Amino acid sequence: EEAELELLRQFDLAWQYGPCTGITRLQRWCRAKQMGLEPPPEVWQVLKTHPGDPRFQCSLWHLYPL
Amino acid sequence: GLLAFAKRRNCCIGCRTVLSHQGAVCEFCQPRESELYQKEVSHLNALEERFSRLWTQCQRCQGSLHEDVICTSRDCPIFYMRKKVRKDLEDQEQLLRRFGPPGPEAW
Amino acid sequence: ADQLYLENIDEFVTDQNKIVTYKWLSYTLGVHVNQAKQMLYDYVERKRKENSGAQLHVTYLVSGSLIQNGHSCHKVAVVREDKLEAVKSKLAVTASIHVYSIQKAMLKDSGPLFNTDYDILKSNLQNCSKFSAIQCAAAVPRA
Amino acid sequence: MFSEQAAQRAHTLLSPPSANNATFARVPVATYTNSSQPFRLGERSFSRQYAHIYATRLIQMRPFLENRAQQHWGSGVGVKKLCELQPEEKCCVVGTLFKAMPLQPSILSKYIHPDDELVLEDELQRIKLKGTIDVSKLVTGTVLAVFGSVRDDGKFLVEDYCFADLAPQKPAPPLDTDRFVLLVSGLGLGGGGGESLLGTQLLVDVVTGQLGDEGEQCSAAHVSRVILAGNLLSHSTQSASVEAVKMLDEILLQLSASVPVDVMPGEFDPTNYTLPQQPLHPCMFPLATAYSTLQLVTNPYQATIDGVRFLGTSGQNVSDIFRYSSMEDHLEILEWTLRVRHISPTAPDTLGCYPFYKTDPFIFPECPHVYFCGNTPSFGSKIIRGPEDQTVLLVTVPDFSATQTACLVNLRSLACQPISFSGFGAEDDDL
Numbered sequence: 001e002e003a004e005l006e007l008l009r010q011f012d013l014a015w016q017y018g019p020c021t022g023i024t025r026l027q028r029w030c031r032a033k034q035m036g037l038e039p040p041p042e043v044w045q046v047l048k049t050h051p052g053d054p055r056f057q058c059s060l061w062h063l064y065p066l
Numbered sequence: 067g068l069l070a071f072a073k074r075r076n077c078c079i080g081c082r083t084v085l086s087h088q089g090a091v092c093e094f095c096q097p098r099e100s101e102l103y104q105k106e107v108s109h110l111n112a113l114e115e116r117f118s119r120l121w122t123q124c125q126r127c128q129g130s131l132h133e134d135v136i137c138t139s140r141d142c143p144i145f146y147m148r149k150k151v152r153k154d155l156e157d158q159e160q161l162l163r164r165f166g167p168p169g170p171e172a173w
Numbered sequence: 174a175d176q177l178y179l180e181n182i183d184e185f186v187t188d189q190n191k192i193v194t195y196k197w198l199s200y201t202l203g204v205h206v207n208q209a210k211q212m213l214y215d216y217v218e219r220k221r222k223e224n225s226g227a228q229l230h231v232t233y234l235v236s237g238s239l240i241q242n243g244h245s246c247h248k249v250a251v252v253r254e255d256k257l258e259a260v261k262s263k264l265a266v267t268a269s270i271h272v273y274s275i276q277k278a279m280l281k282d283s284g285p286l287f288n289t290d291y292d293i294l295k296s297n298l299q300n301c302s303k304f305s306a307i308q309c310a311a312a313v314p315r316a
Numbered sequence: 317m318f319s320e321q322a323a324q325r326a327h328t329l330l331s332p333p334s335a336n337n338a339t340f341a342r343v344p345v346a347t348y349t350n351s352s353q354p355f356r357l358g359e360r361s362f363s364r365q366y367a368h369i370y371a372t373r374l375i376q377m378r379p380f381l382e383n384r385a386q387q388h389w390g391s392g393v394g395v396k397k398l399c400e401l402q403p404e405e406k407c408c409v410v411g412t413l414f415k416a417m418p419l420q421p422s423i424l425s426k427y428i429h430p431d432d433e434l435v436l437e438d439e440l441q442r443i444k445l446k447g448t449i450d451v452s453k454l455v456t457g458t459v460l461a462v463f464g465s466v467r468d469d470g471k472f473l474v475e476d477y478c479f480a481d482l483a484p485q486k487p488a489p490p491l492d493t494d495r496f497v498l499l500v501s502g503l504g505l506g507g508g509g510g511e512s513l514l515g516t517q518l519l520v521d522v523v524t525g526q527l528g529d530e531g532e533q534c535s536a537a538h539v540s541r542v543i544l545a546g547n548l549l550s551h552s553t554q555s556a557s558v559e560a561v562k563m564l565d566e567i568l569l570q571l572s573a574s575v576p577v578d579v580m581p582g583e584f585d586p587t588n589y590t591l592p593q594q595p596l597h598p599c600m601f602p603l604a605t606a607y608s609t610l611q612l613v614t615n616p617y618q619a620t621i622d623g624v625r626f627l628g629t630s631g632q633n634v635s636d637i638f639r640y641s642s643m644e645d646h647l648e649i650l651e652w653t654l655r656v657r658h659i660s661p662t663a664p665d666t667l668g669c670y671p672f673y674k675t676d677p678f679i680f681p682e683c684p685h686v687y688f689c690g691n692t693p694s695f696g697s698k699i700i701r702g703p704e705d706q707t708v709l710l711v712t713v714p715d716f717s718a719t720q721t722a723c724l725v726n727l728r729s730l731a732c733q734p735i736s737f738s739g740f741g742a743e744d745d746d747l
């Protein structure tokens with residue numbers, strides 16, 4: 001923790017995985033894996049050792065009335 | 067405070083009588099259900115047409131068609147008029163699922 | 174036999190002053206459709222050979238192929254009593270001729286010939302494939 | 317085809333009554349498979365934005381255009397991203413169009429104007445385009461490859477450009493005895509004349525087996541299916557619609573007695589507005605839901621009818637392209653839609669759709685044998701060829717309320733013949 005919260009914030013702004021501020025984080029991870037762009041096997045391995053926490057399993061701007 | 071402790075009583079679409087069970091129509095107002103389905107699908111149809119004209123206008127005012135919109139401009143009518151149609155559509159879509167589905171989906 | 178439907182048509186047409194299509198005369202007398210067309214042709218031939226000056230008007234149906242500009246279309250028309258042979262000579266191939274209706278006093282357009290068939294359908298709604306030449310098998314009331 | 321066989325016998329009906337009259341049987345429909353499952357939407361969550369659709373469109377359409385620009389301009393390839401371009405160097409770019417037209421209405425008849433620009437756009441930035449390219453034939457939303465160089469004013473000079481093209485197509489088995497399929501569109505129940513009423517009556521009377529001699533009754537018994545394609549209730553003004561569903565229920569009852577029927581929603585029909593239109597609810601048809609020969613589908617309809625695979629719409633993509641382009645011929649617009657590998661490229665920018673996010677479903681994944689359209693103002697049909705062994709029959713279905721014309725498609729020779737109905741009107745040739 002506090003190092004796992006920057007890896008996800010770095011996965012969320014890389015443009016080669018998609019334009020993602022409307023959906024979940026694991027849905028975008030599996031969308032890129034289907035098309036197989038290059039999802040890395042570390043943004044998966046922190047979404048498995050946690051429960052349904054809203055500060056891991058949510059996009060950066062999931063507040064913010066946009 | 068008290069607003070969270072809802073019961074969410076269902077109501078007849080025809081004559082507004084609260085009753086037990088989830089069916090949309092009332093037992094006295096049943097022979098008239100095709101007309102009550104006809105009514106309100108022309109409302110869902112007009113909310114669908116308003117969602118699409120607004121959420122693609124932000125893409126042309128922003129410049130790009132491939133990246134997210136971030137513009138909370140308080141002097142634009144576009145902002146917060148694009149926020150309420152999501153909820154109107156959220157509500158009007160769920161009122162028509164009182165009626166069954168028009169077919170299967172797992173075939 | 175013959176006098177039965179001959180007198181029935183002679184009271185339907187000339188006394189009650191009605192308009193008799195083949196489908197009305199097959200829902201009245203409970204007859205097959207082709208046999209009803211044959212009945213109407215029998216009546217018109219008898220009463221047009223007897224007298225030649227009756228108060229009787231006919232309308233027929235002509236169907237068949239055509240070529241307008243290269244392409245082969247299929248034209249189907251409900252025609253009056255004056256214009257039959259010209260419509261028959263415009264066509265290329267002929268495929269169907271029978272009788273459609275008879276009248277007492279002449280109409281102006283094809284208005285009431287839909288009203289009659291519609292109204293006799295309106296009360297007779299559990300049977301339409303009853304006197305039909307095609308009898309499918311998978312269409313029986315199930316759901 | 318049909319009217320050739322309809323004269324192949326003897327004529328009995330200008331005769332006095334007989335002992336027997338012949339009857340027949342409807343031909344079996346021993347194979348059918350609906351494969352329109354990507355258009356049936358079970359969950360239907362809104363609250364996304366329209367940027368997930370363009371991104372997956374580009375990501376899926378990119379290898380087709382790379383693989384065609386290789387064999388169309390030589391394997392000495394120069395394909396490059398829009399940011400890595402050097403001034404005045406020959407390269408190939410793969411991107412998405414955006415047409416910048418004024419006179420297109422904003423929130424607060426054709427719409428093409430003599431000045432309007434094209435812009436090639438990728439995920440990161442844009443660039444303007446001039447040179448040898450058509451300014452008014454192309455529409456916003458087409459993905460294409462292009463050849464040229466970055467000039468000094470920041471613009472781009474285009475020499476030639478290529479589209480995605482036709483998809484692969486497996487061959488169909490041949491048939492033994494010819495079966496026919498009838499296509500109708502746009503009855504317009506609610507307004508539109510009285511000659512349309514007798515035309516609709518004569519059409520259902522021919523197909524059900526009530527009209528004509530043993531030739532017509534032998535030939536209409538071979539018609540295996542009936543497809544009704546959109547715009548069933550033409551409406552004069554919304555703000556009438558309740559009394560029209562009763563008559564549509566009666567007509568679908570009189571057709572569900574003999575044939576199998578497939579019914580599709582249209583521009584005015586009681587469904588949603590976005591483009592994968594969902595099937596009609598059965599609670600508006602009391603009478604016709606007794607039989608299991610009536611079926612209700614939606615807009616983008618696929619099927620496999622007796623080996624031959626069909627795909628069609630009710631004519632909402634073709635008229636949308638007709639609004640914001642310069643092409644007039646509807647058969648040409650249908651073939652162009654086939655050429656860019658997308659059923660409706662102008663969506664969403666001027667034709668609304670659902671906000672998908674996983675995969676864009678309007679990209680052709682295979683090639684259909686038949687491909688029809690909806691409510692077009694006149695009949696037309698054609699056969700086109702692919703680069704490989706790919707042949708496609710293209711039909712435009714007319715509109716019944718004006719022309720009173722339907723189409724017969726043979727399933728063994730694969731040809732289409734028009735059928736027209738016309739009762740006599742107020743006609744007197746002595747004036």
Ligand code: SF4
Pocket residue numbers: 123124127128135137138139142143144145
């Ligand atoms: S909310 Fe209004 S100002 Fe902001 S991008 Fe949309 S249209 Fe433009």
Ligand SMILES: [Zn+2]
Pocket residue numbers: 078079080081082083091092093094095
């Ligand atoms: Zn009630």
